[PDB]
Amino acid sequence: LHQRAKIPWRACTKYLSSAGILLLSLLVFSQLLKHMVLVAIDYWLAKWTD
């Protein structure tokens, strides 16, 4: 049980702390923004093809 611990908080905090405040939130918003457009272009295609 102790071995099978992903340690997510520790590893995520290390990457988050090293990355800082600006370049961490930017990546989250940028990646999410890119994918919401991908859903949108398919959805817009459906409406146009309709």
Partner: protein, 148 residues
């Protein structure tokens, strides 16, 4: 790995969101699958890391043995212990290969199980989508988006 994980998980949630939007009934049908999927995911992870770690450990002796057999070839043959060292290699090679073979079997078991789960989603999405378009007059393009 971080970039691939984010894209893979975002593509996944995007797919379920579209299918639920295309057919709200799928939301109900998402409850069983998202339950069993977790089990498949949870068990595989515990079976993967151990296997992956075991694989890496089993690579250390084999390759090291090779180095010894060239750094001490004269002594190895002088002792007339070539047969024992050949048997030592075969045990080492078998241990590494079965570690790798089981990892592939674990990878394939997850892939087939997730493939069946995704195939069930296709049937559920198709059935609900055709029912919606024949009776409730769902958009034809929306049916295509759900299936794709």
């Amino acid at each position: 790995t971080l970039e691939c994980l984010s894209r893979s998980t975002l593509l996944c949630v995007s797919a379920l969101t579209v299918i639920s939007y295309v057919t709200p009934v799928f939301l109900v049908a998402l409850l069983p699958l998202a339950v069993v999927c977790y089990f498949i995911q949870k068990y595989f992870r515990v079976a993967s890391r151990d296997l992956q770690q075991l694989d890496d450990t089993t690579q250390l002796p084999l390759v090291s043995h090779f180095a010894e057999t060239v750094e001490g070839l004269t002594t190895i043959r002088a002792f007339r212990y070539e047969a024992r060292f050949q048997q030592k290699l075969l045990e080492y090679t078998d241990s590494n290969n079965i570690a790798s073979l089981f990892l592939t079997a674990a990878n394939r078991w997850l892939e087939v199980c997730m493939e069946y789960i995704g195939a069930c989603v296709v049937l559920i999405a198709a059935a609900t989508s055709i029912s919606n378009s024949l009776h409730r007059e769902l958009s034809a393009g929306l049916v295509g988006l759900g299936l794709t």
